[PDB]
GROMACS .gro file of N, CA, C and O in nm:
model
  460
    1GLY      N    1   7.791  -7.948 -10.680
    1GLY     CA    2   7.806  -8.018 -10.834
    1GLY      C    3   7.946  -8.098 -10.869
    1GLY      O    4   7.918  -8.178 -10.947
    2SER      N    5   8.039  -8.092 -10.741
    2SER     CA    6   8.138  -8.180 -10.728
    2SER      C    7   8.125  -8.329 -10.724
    2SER      O    8   8.219  -8.438 -10.780
    3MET      N    9   7.943  -8.350 -10.685
    3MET     CA   10   7.905  -8.480 -10.661
    3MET      C   11   7.893  -8.542 -10.816
    3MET      O   12   7.791  -8.596 -10.842
    4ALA      N   13   7.986  -8.543 -10.901
    4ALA     CA   14   7.999  -8.578 -11.058
    4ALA      C   15   7.979  -8.754 -11.064
    4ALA      O   16   8.055  -8.866 -10.979
    5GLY      N   17   7.904  -8.828 -11.121
    5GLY     CA   18   7.836  -8.949 -11.153
    5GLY      C   19   7.794  -8.988 -11.029
    5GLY      O   20   7.657  -9.015 -11.010
    6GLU      N   21   7.872  -9.021 -10.933
    6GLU     CA   22   7.791  -9.066 -10.822
    6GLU      C   23   7.731  -8.959 -10.734
    6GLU      O   24   7.804  -8.883 -10.623
    7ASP      N   25   7.616  -8.890 -10.771
    7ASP     CA   26   7.517  -8.800 -10.725
    7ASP      C   27   7.480  -8.823 -10.614
    7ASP      O   28   7.447  -8.944 -10.575
    8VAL      N   29   7.415  -8.737 -10.546
    8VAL     CA   30   7.387  -8.741 -10.393
    8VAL      C   31   7.243  -8.704 -10.348
    8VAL      O   32   7.200  -8.678 -10.264
    9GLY      N   33   7.167  -8.634 -10.465
    9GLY     CA   34   7.052  -8.539 -10.496
    9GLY      C   35   7.071  -8.434 -10.433
    9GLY      O   36   7.041  -8.349 -10.504
   10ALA      N   37   7.121  -8.414 -10.304
   10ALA     CA   38   7.119  -8.290 -10.217
   10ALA      C   39   7.224  -8.302 -10.119
   10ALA      O   40   7.208  -8.371 -10.038
   11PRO      N   41   7.335  -8.195 -10.106
   11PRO     CA   42   7.419  -8.208  -9.992
   11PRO      C   43   7.317  -8.161  -9.817
   11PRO      O   44   7.199  -8.158  -9.860
   12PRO      N   45   7.343  -8.201  -9.723
   12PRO     CA   46   7.288  -8.199  -9.589
   12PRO      C   47   7.255  -8.053  -9.573
   12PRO      O   48   7.378  -7.986  -9.529
   13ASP      N   49   7.146  -8.004  -9.574
   13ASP     CA   50   7.124  -7.885  -9.574
   13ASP      C   51   7.168  -7.842  -9.419
   13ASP      O   52   7.145  -7.679  -9.429
   14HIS      N   53   7.174  -7.891  -9.332
   14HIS     CA   54   7.195  -7.860  -9.204
   14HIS      C   55   7.304  -8.004  -9.208
   14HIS      O   56   7.311  -8.070  -9.218
   15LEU      N   57   7.407  -7.953  -9.107
   15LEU     CA   58   7.486  -8.014  -9.025
   15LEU      C   59   7.476  -7.989  -8.881
   15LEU      O   60   7.503  -7.896  -8.841
   16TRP      N   61   7.446  -8.086  -8.770
   16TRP     CA   62   7.400  -8.045  -8.612
   16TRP      C   63   7.526  -8.150  -8.566
   16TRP      O   64   7.512  -8.250  -8.554
   17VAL      N   65   7.602  -8.095  -8.473
   17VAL     CA   66   7.688  -8.158  -8.408
   17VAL      C   67   7.608  -8.221  -8.286
   17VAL      O   68   7.514  -8.162  -8.237
   18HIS      N   69   7.624  -8.372  -8.272
   18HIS     CA   70   7.569  -8.448  -8.172
   18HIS      C   71   7.655  -8.535  -8.085
   18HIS      O   72   7.633  -8.528  -7.963
   19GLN      N   73   7.815  -8.546  -8.140
   19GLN     CA   74   7.885  -8.636  -8.085
   19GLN      C   75   8.068  -8.572  -8.098
   19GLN      O   76   8.041  -8.461  -8.163
   20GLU      N   77   8.129  -8.641  -8.042
   20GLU     CA   78   8.257  -8.563  -8.040
   20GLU      C   79   8.320  -8.558  -8.178
   20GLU      O   80   8.370  -8.696  -8.223
   21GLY      N   81   8.353  -8.471  -8.240
   21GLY     CA   82   8.393  -8.446  -8.395
   21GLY      C   83   8.293  -8.481  -8.446
   21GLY      O   84   8.328  -8.520  -8.611
   22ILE      N   85   8.166  -8.515  -8.448
   22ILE     CA   86   8.065  -8.579  -8.536
   22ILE      C   87   7.911  -8.508  -8.543
   22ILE      O   88   7.844  -8.470  -8.421
   23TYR      N   89   7.899  -8.475  -8.676
   23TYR     CA   90   7.773  -8.407  -8.688
   23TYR      C   91   7.698  -8.531  -8.729
   23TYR      O   92   7.707  -8.639  -8.752
   24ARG      N   93   7.563  -8.495  -8.745
   24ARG     CA   94   7.472  -8.546  -8.811
   24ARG      C   95   7.381  -8.481  -8.920
   24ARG      O   96   7.350  -8.354  -8.926
   25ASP      N   97   7.310  -8.554  -9.006
   25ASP     CA   98   7.268  -8.499  -9.156
   25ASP      C   99   7.104  -8.480  -9.118
   25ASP      O  100   7.043  -8.541  -9.023
   26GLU      N  101   7.045  -8.451  -9.202
   26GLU     CA  102   6.873  -8.412  -9.183
   26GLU      C  103   6.842  -8.545  -9.256
   26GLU      O  104   6.712  -8.611  -9.215
   27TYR      N  105   6.915  -8.631  -9.292
   27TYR     CA  106   6.895  -8.784  -9.383
   27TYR      C  107   6.876  -8.887  -9.274
   27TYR      O  108   6.884  -8.983  -9.258
   28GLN      N  109   6.947  -8.838  -9.109
   28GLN     CA  110   6.962  -8.878  -9.005
   28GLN      C  111   7.089  -8.998  -8.992
   28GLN      O  112   7.095  -9.100  -8.915
   29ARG      N  113   7.194  -8.961  -9.096
   29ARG     CA  114   7.314  -9.046  -9.083
   29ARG      C  115   7.419  -8.952  -9.028
   29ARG      O  116   7.390  -8.821  -9.029
   30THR      N  117   7.511  -9.015  -8.969
   30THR     CA  118   7.619  -8.933  -8.896
   30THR      C  119   7.747  -8.889  -9.015
   30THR      O  120   7.773  -8.967  -9.086
   31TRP      N  121   7.809  -8.796  -8.973
   31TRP     CA  122   7.935  -8.717  -9.026
   31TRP      C  123   8.034  -8.642  -8.925
   31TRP      O  124   7.991  -8.621  -8.852
   32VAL      N  125   8.154  -8.771  -8.955
   32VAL     CA  126   8.261  -8.753  -8.907
   32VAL      C  127   8.361  -8.649  -8.908
   32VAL      O  128   8.391  -8.641  -9.068
   33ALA      N  129   8.337  -8.511  -8.864
   33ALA     CA  130   8.418  -8.394  -8.935
   33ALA      C  131   8.568  -8.388  -8.832
   33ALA      O  132   8.578  -8.425  -8.743
   34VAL      N  133   8.653  -8.376  -8.966
   34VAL     CA  134   8.829  -8.375  -8.901
   34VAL      C  135   8.845  -8.213  -8.980
   34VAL      O  136   8.804  -8.178  -9.048
   35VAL      N  137   8.959  -8.165  -8.942
   35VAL     CA  138   9.004  -8.029  -9.004
   35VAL      C  139   9.142  -8.047  -9.049
   35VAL      O  140   9.219  -8.116  -9.017
   36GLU      N  141   9.179  -7.960  -9.128
   36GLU     CA  142   9.331  -7.879  -9.182
   36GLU      C  143   9.309  -7.798  -9.235
   36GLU      O  144   9.195  -7.700  -9.203
   37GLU      N  145   9.416  -7.691  -9.243
   37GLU     CA  146   9.431  -7.546  -9.238
   37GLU      C  147   9.534  -7.537  -9.399
   37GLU      O  148   9.547  -7.625  -9.479
   38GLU      N  149   9.472  -7.433  -9.448
   38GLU     CA  150   9.516  -7.334  -9.566
   38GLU      C  151   9.587  -7.185  -9.533
   38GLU      O  152   9.553  -7.158  -9.426
   39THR      N  153   9.642  -7.140  -9.625
   39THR     CA  154   9.753  -7.014  -9.611
   39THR      C  155   9.661  -6.900  -9.584
   39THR      O  156   9.719  -6.811  -9.539
   40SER      N  157   9.551  -6.907  -9.566
   40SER     CA  158   9.425  -6.829  -9.486
   40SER      C  159   9.293  -6.874  -9.461
   40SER      O  160   9.187  -6.765  -9.455
   41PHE      N  161   9.305  -6.993  -9.446
   41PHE     CA  162   9.159  -7.058  -9.406
   41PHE      C  163   9.204  -7.201  -9.287
   41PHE      O  164   9.299  -7.255  -9.268
   42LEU      N  165   9.078  -7.210  -9.235
   42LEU     CA  166   9.079  -7.375  -9.189
   42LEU      C  167   8.916  -7.408  -9.241
   42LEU      O  168   8.841  -7.373  -9.284
   43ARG      N  169   8.980  -7.579  -9.271
   43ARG     CA  170   8.891  -7.677  -9.358
   43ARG      C  171   8.874  -7.790  -9.308
   43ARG      O  172   8.957  -7.842  -9.260
   44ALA      N  173   8.703  -7.780  -9.276
   44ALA     CA  174   8.698  -7.902  -9.193
   44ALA      C  175   8.653  -7.999  -9.335
   44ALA      O  176   8.561  -7.993  -9.425
   45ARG      N  177   8.686  -8.130  -9.297
   45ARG     CA  178   8.653  -8.248  -9.391
   45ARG      C  179   8.569  -8.320  -9.294
   45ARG      O  180   8.592  -8.365  -9.207
   46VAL      N  181   8.450  -8.335  -9.345
   46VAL     CA  182   8.345  -8.367  -9.318
   46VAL      C  183   8.307  -8.514  -9.393
   46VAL      O  184   8.278  -8.510  -9.518
   47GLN      N  185   8.260  -8.585  -9.281
   47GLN     CA  186   8.291  -8.741  -9.401
   47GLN      C  187   8.131  -8.831  -9.331
   47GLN      O  188   8.165  -8.858  -9.218
   48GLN      N  189   8.058  -8.835  -9.398
   48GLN     CA  190   7.922  -8.972  -9.373
   48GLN      C  191   7.996  -9.093  -9.351
   48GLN      O  192   7.982  -9.160  -9.444
   49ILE      N  193   7.993  -9.144  -9.216
   49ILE     CA  194   8.000  -9.298  -9.172
   49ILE      C  195   7.931  -9.319  -9.059
   49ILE      O  196   7.894  -9.224  -8.988
   50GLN      N  197   7.876  -9.439  -9.068
   50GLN     CA  198   7.781  -9.452  -8.980
   50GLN      C  199   7.829  -9.509  -8.835
   50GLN      O  200   7.931  -9.598  -8.804
   51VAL      N  201   7.826  -9.415  -8.735
   51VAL     CA  202   7.856  -9.466  -8.581
   51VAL      C  203   7.743  -9.437  -8.521
   51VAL      O  204   7.612  -9.363  -8.562
   52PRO      N  205   7.708  -9.522  -8.384
   52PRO     CA  206   7.577  -9.513  -8.300
   52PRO      C  207   7.537  -9.388  -8.233
   52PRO      O  208   7.628  -9.291  -8.165
   53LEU      N  209   7.443  -9.320  -8.271
   53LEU     CA  210   7.410  -9.215  -8.199
   53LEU      C  211   7.381  -9.215  -8.053
   53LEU      O  212   7.327  -9.333  -8.007
   54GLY      N  213   7.373  -9.128  -7.988
   54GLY     CA  214   7.421  -9.102  -7.831
   54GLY      C  215   7.476  -8.960  -7.813
   54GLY      O  216   7.627  -8.950  -7.831
   55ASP      N  217   7.396  -8.843  -7.774
   55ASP     CA  218   7.423  -8.722  -7.787
   55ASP      C  219   7.529  -8.655  -7.661
   55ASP      O  220   7.502  -8.724  -7.558
   56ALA      N  221   7.638  -8.621  -7.703
   56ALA     CA  222   7.751  -8.645  -7.624
   56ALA      C  223   7.785  -8.491  -7.561
   56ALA      O  224   7.904  -8.450  -7.524
   57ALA      N  225   7.685  -8.418  -7.543
   57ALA     CA  226   7.691  -8.277  -7.473
   57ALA      C  227   7.799  -8.202  -7.516
   57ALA      O  228   7.791  -8.073  -7.496
   58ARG      N  229   7.870  -8.172  -7.598
   58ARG     CA  230   7.953  -8.090  -7.687
   58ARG      C  231   8.074  -8.048  -7.593
   58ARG      O  232   8.059  -7.871  -7.627
   59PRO      N  233   8.117  -8.105  -7.508
   59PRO     CA  234   8.225  -7.991  -7.447
   59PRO      C  235   8.367  -7.963  -7.536
   59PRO      O  236   8.417  -7.835  -7.548
   60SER      N  237   8.425  -8.044  -7.610
   60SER     CA  238   8.512  -8.039  -7.779
   60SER      C  239   8.452  -7.919  -7.831
   60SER      O  240   8.550  -7.847  -7.890
   61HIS      N  241   8.313  -7.932  -7.871
   61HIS     CA  242   8.275  -7.810  -7.975
   61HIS      C  243   8.234  -7.677  -7.943
   61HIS      O  244   8.297  -7.602  -8.017
   62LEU      N  245   8.232  -7.668  -7.785
   62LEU     CA  246   8.207  -7.555  -7.751
   62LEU      C  247   8.381  -7.512  -7.729
   62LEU      O  248   8.412  -7.393  -7.784
   63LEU      N  249   8.461  -7.596  -7.676
   63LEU     CA  250   8.612  -7.544  -7.624
   63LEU      C  251   8.676  -7.530  -7.766
   63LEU      O  252   8.778  -7.422  -7.757
   64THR      N  253   8.674  -7.616  -7.830
   64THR     CA  254   8.713  -7.569  -7.961
   64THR      C  255   8.618  -7.417  -8.029
   64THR      O  256   8.735  -7.322  -8.055
   65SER      N  257   8.522  -7.484  -8.102
   65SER     CA  258   8.423  -7.385  -8.163
   65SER      C  259   8.499  -7.325  -8.259
   65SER      O  260   8.481  -7.248  -8.334
   66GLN      N  261   8.663  -7.388  -8.354
   66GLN     CA  262   8.672  -7.355  -8.492
   66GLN      C  263   8.492  -7.427  -8.550
   66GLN      O  264   8.425  -7.333  -8.623
   67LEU      N  265   8.517  -7.518  -8.547
   67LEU     CA  266   8.398  -7.635  -8.639
   67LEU      C  267   8.242  -7.601  -8.555
   67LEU      O  268   8.289  -7.570  -8.419
   68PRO      N  269   8.156  -7.556  -8.557
   68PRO     CA  270   8.009  -7.499  -8.505
   68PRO      C  271   7.928  -7.586  -8.462
   68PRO      O  272   7.957  -7.695  -8.472
   69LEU      N  273   7.855  -7.558  -8.376
   69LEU     CA  274   7.756  -7.613  -8.315
   69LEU      C  275   7.640  -7.664  -8.426
   69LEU      O  276   7.611  -7.813  -8.438
   70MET      N  277   7.618  -7.563  -8.523
   70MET     CA  278   7.560  -7.603  -8.675
   70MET      C  279   7.620  -7.562  -8.780
   70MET      O  280   7.646  -7.454  -8.761
   71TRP      N  281   7.582  -7.596  -8.873
   71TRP     CA  282   7.623  -7.562  -9.004
   71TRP      C  283   7.482  -7.584  -9.116
   71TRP      O  284   7.425  -7.643  -9.056
   72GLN      N  285   7.465  -7.473  -9.186
   72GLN     CA  286   7.349  -7.441  -9.259
   72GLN      C  287   7.402  -7.416  -9.423
   72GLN      O  288   7.465  -7.306  -9.439
   73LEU      N  289   7.366  -7.469  -9.492
   73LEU     CA  290   7.354  -7.463  -9.646
   73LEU      C  291   7.326  -7.323  -9.721
   73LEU      O  292   7.208  -7.270  -9.669
   74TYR      N  293   7.427  -7.276  -9.756
   74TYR     CA  294   7.431  -7.151  -9.824
   74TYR      C  295   7.435  -7.155 -10.000
   74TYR      O  296   7.518  -7.216 -10.028
   75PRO      N  297   7.358  -7.015 -10.032
   75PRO     CA  298   7.444  -7.008 -10.181
   75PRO      C  299   7.553  -7.008 -10.240
   75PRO      O  300   7.647  -6.991 -10.162
   76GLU      N  301   7.574  -7.005 -10.373
   76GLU     CA  302   7.716  -7.014 -10.425
   76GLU      C  303   7.783  -7.131 -10.349
   76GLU      O  304   7.890  -7.149 -10.394
   77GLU      N  305   7.720  -7.255 -10.302
   77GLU     CA  306   7.776  -7.377 -10.247
   77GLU      C  307   7.840  -7.296 -10.127
   77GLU      O  308   7.989  -7.338 -10.152
   78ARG      N  309   7.788  -7.269 -10.015
   78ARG     CA  310   7.861  -7.211  -9.885
   78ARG      C  311   7.800  -7.287  -9.786
   78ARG      O  312   7.673  -7.356  -9.829
   79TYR      N  313   7.843  -7.260  -9.684
   79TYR     CA  314   7.741  -7.343  -9.557
   79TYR      C  315   7.821  -7.234  -9.430
   79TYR      O  316   7.902  -7.190  -9.418
   80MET      N  317   7.703  -7.130  -9.410
   80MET     CA  318   7.673  -7.072  -9.294
   80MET      C  319   7.703  -7.157  -9.225
   80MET      O  320   7.670  -7.271  -9.171
   81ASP      N  321   7.757  -7.072  -9.069
   81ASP     CA  322   7.739  -7.177  -8.928
   81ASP      C  323   7.651  -7.063  -8.852
   81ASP      O  324   7.624  -6.958  -8.857
   82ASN      N  325   7.613  -7.132  -8.735
   82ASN     CA  326   7.562  -7.100  -8.630
   82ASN      C  327   7.626  -6.964  -8.540
   82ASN      O  328   7.533  -6.888  -8.435
   83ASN      N  329   7.720  -6.965  -8.563
   83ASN     CA  330   7.852  -6.863  -8.507
   83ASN      C  331   7.857  -6.727  -8.590
   83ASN      O  332   7.929  -6.678  -8.590
   84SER      N  333   7.776  -6.737  -8.727
   84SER     CA  334   7.773  -6.642  -8.786
   84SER      C  335   7.896  -6.618  -8.867
   84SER      O  336   7.931  -6.496  -8.931
   85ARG      N  337   7.982  -6.741  -8.898
   85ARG     CA  338   8.083  -6.729  -8.983
   85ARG      C  339   8.037  -6.819  -9.104
   85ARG      O  340   7.930  -6.920  -9.071
   86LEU      N  341   8.138  -6.847  -9.219
   86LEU     CA  342   8.081  -6.865  -9.342
   86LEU      C  343   8.200  -6.959  -9.390
   86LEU      O  344   8.304  -6.931  -9.406
   87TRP      N  345   8.153  -7.098  -9.437
   87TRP     CA  346   8.244  -7.217  -9.458
   87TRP      C  347   8.218  -7.230  -9.622
   87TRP      O  348   8.111  -7.275  -9.684
   88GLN      N  349   8.318  -7.206  -9.697
   88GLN     CA  350   8.294  -7.228  -9.855
   88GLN      C  351   8.308  -7.382  -9.877
   88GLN      O  352   8.426  -7.468  -9.826
   89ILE      N  353   8.180  -7.421  -9.962
   89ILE     CA  354   8.233  -7.589 -10.012
   89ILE      C  355   8.357  -7.573 -10.092
   89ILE      O  356   8.370  -7.512 -10.195
   90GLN      N  357   8.446  -7.664 -10.062
   90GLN     CA  358   8.537  -7.714 -10.154
   90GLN      C  359   8.498  -7.876 -10.241
   90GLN      O  360   8.581  -7.855 -10.323
   91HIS      N  361   8.448  -7.884 -10.177
   91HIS     CA  362   8.392  -8.053 -10.234
   91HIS      C  363   8.254  -8.103 -10.184
   91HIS      O  364   8.267  -8.069 -10.005
   92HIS      N  365   8.150  -8.138 -10.227
   92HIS     CA  366   8.045  -8.199 -10.210
   92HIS      C  367   8.043  -8.318 -10.273
   92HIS      O  368   8.033  -8.288 -10.415
   93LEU      N  369   8.084  -8.441 -10.254
   93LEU     CA  370   8.068  -8.595 -10.314
   93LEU      C  371   8.044  -8.705 -10.268
   93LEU      O  372   8.037  -8.700 -10.092
   94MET      N  373   8.037  -8.822 -10.312
   94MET     CA  374   8.031  -8.948 -10.253
   94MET      C  375   8.101  -9.069 -10.311
   94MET      O  376   8.108  -9.061 -10.427
   95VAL      N  377   8.131  -9.147 -10.251
   95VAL     CA  378   8.215  -9.254 -10.281
   95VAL      C  379   8.192  -9.391 -10.192
   95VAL      O  380   8.189  -9.387 -10.129
   96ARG      N  381   8.138  -9.486 -10.292
   96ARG     CA  382   8.051  -9.623 -10.202
   96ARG      C  383   7.990  -9.568 -10.097
   96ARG      O  384   7.945  -9.675  -9.997
   97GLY      N  385   7.889  -9.494 -10.138
   97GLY     CA  386   7.821  -9.443 -10.030
   97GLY      C  387   7.879  -9.356  -9.897
   97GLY      O  388   7.771  -9.279  -9.794
   98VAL      N  389   8.017  -9.376  -9.885
   98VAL     CA  390   8.042  -9.275  -9.793
   98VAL      C  391   8.029  -9.080  -9.869
   98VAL      O  392   8.098  -9.090  -9.962
   99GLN      N  393   7.964  -9.039  -9.814
   99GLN     CA  394   7.965  -8.880  -9.828
   99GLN      C  395   8.104  -8.777  -9.820
   99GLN      O  396   8.119  -8.848  -9.666
  100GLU      N  397   8.139  -8.732  -9.843
  100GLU     CA  398   8.252  -8.634  -9.800
  100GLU      C  399   8.256  -8.483  -9.854
  100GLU      O  400   8.168  -8.487  -9.956
  101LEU      N  401   8.260  -8.393  -9.766
  101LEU     CA  402   8.213  -8.261  -9.774
  101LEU      C  403   8.336  -8.198  -9.722
  101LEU      O  404   8.359  -8.192  -9.576
  102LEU      N  405   8.400  -8.108  -9.792
  102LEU     CA  406   8.507  -8.023  -9.763
  102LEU      C  407   8.433  -7.862  -9.739
  102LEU      O  408   8.384  -7.810  -9.839
  103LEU      N  409   8.440  -7.809  -9.629
  103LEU     CA  410   8.360  -7.709  -9.593
  103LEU      C  411   8.504  -7.595  -9.531
  103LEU      O  412   8.634  -7.639  -9.439
  104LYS      N  413   8.491  -7.470  -9.598
  104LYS     CA  414   8.643  -7.386  -9.531
  104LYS      C  415   8.605  -7.250  -9.514
  104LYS      O  416   8.558  -7.193  -9.620
  105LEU      N  417   8.633  -7.247  -9.351
  105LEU     CA  418   8.596  -7.153  -9.301
  105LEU      C  419   8.668  -7.021  -9.365
  105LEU      O  420   8.772  -6.997  -9.384
  106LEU      N  421   8.593  -6.901  -9.425
  106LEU     CA  422   8.643  -6.785  -9.511
  106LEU      C  423   8.738  -6.723  -9.421
  106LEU      O  424   8.733  -6.729  -9.266
  107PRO      N  425   8.856  -6.622  -9.422
  107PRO     CA  426   8.953  -6.574  -9.339
  107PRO      C  427   8.905  -6.559  -9.212
  107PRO      O  428   8.815  -6.453  -9.196
  108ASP      N  429   8.952  -6.603  -9.102
  108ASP     CA  430   8.928  -6.568  -8.973
  108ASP      C  431   9.037  -6.492  -8.897
  108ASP      O  432   9.153  -6.526  -8.941
  109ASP      N  433   9.026  -6.455  -8.786
  109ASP     CA  434   9.140  -6.412  -8.698
  109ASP      C  435   9.198  -6.530  -8.624
  109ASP      O  436   9.163  -6.554  -8.480
  110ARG      N  437   9.280  -6.586  -8.671
  110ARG     CA  438   9.352  -6.699  -8.658
  110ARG      C  439   9.440  -6.698  -8.596
  110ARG      O  440   9.584  -6.694  -8.594
  111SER      N  441   9.417  -6.633  -8.439
  111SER     CA  442   9.514  -6.596  -8.297
  111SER      C  443   9.593  -6.749  -8.259
  111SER      O  444   9.525  -6.848  -8.292
  112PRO      N  445   9.714  -6.717  -8.234
  112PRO     CA  446   9.819  -6.875  -8.171
  112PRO      C  447   9.712  -6.915  -8.054
  112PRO      O  448   9.639  -6.875  -7.972
  113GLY      N  449   9.738  -7.076  -8.056
  113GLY     CA  450   9.683  -7.167  -7.928
  113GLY      C  451   9.528  -7.157  -7.967
  113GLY      O  452   9.516  -7.288  -7.973
  114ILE      N  453   9.428  -7.085  -7.976
  114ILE     CA  454   9.303  -7.107  -7.976
  114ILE      C  455   9.260  -6.953  -8.092
  114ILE      O  456   9.310  -6.853  -8.092
  115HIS      N  457   9.133  -6.950  -8.144
  115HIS     CA  458   9.079  -6.889  -8.224
  115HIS      C  459   8.913  -6.924  -8.280
  115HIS      O  460   8.905  -7.029  -8.337
   0.00000   0.00000   0.00000
């Protein structure tokens, strides 16, 4: 509902990682995921921007696996992931056709180095 004025019909009901830090929509458009952290969270900022498809086998996304192989839209405006953790929406919106989506992984065992 954060898509005020510049509505988007509906958010990407899945995001499928396909390229290096890059998800794809159901609408077949590419979504660059970056990350920041908060005082008990990690927050992926996913941003829809056109890059050439070409499946990059996901060494990054295995090795990291903070951000998932797949996200799946969920009630209360959240996203489940394929790893069975859950990312709360902090916004879904769009600006001049660039969709952006803040996804906030609910409190995890954030061990040092890796989690």
